[PDB]
Design a protein around this ligand. Sequence first.
Ligand SMILES: CC(C)c1onc(-c2c(Cl)cccc2Cl)c1COc1ccc(/C=C/c2cccc(C(=O)O)c2)c(Cl)c1
Lengths: 229, 11
Amino acid sequence: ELTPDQQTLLHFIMDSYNKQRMPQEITNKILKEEFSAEENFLILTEMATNHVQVLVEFTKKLPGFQTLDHEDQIALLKGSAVEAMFLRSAEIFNKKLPSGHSDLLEERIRNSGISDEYITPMFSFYKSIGELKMTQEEYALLTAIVILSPDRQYIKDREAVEKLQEPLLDVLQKLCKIHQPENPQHFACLLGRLTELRTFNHHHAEMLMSWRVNDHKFTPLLCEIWDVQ
Amino acid sequence: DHQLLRYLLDK
Ligand SMILES: CC(C)c1onc(-c2c(Cl)cccc2Cl)c1COc1ccc(/C=C/c2cccc(C(=O)O)c2)c(Cl)c1
């Protein structure tokens, strides 16, 4: 049984998660545009820059975020952007979302200058997580939880973050006990994704440097979030 | 430092 003080949190969070979506102007390109390593990379860039925007808006609305040291807020945004993006894309492929054009989107990612050493793990992650049959609420809570990770590098007050994250973890667990009483390991299975997600940050920074020396174009927003001269 | 993130956080 979910409490009233908790059912309100989940509602506020589920509310912000569904507030903004990605522009049809952007998502229509996955379908309409030419399939070129160049065009592919540019569409992927456009989507990521845009999502960095939705991420800030979403995070800002997270309960207690705007109260943390402002230098800690940047560290949390800078540290979760890639992971939040893996979760959102995995959700897209997993729920075969219409505005996601999964097959074509996968095409564009499969040919954008990404090393095979990275694509394999990326899609394997997409597959295994899809097989979890996650509910929009699990995606939304794993995202908020990923965003409020106290153990990110350069965090000053790591205790203030834990205080913001623990309430969310509990709501997620309370749900796994309700909608999955048969399978008790479901909660622990969802948290395992937080570790797998971590794993991609090393790979991503490699890619950023690879694309960079190849004179690949990013955006002032992405360069800032991902510390790229 | 971090002009753009700082700006999005104040908007
Ligand atoms: C800069 C670019 C070359 C890039 O370099 N690495 C990744 C990268 C990351 Cl960082 C992580 C995992 C894989 C990949 Cl390839 C990227 C694209 O980054 C994305 C790509 C797609 C999406 C979501 C799209 C979507 C479609 C329909 C709807 C919506 C929606 O939000 O409603 C959202 C998001 Cl969010 C972020």
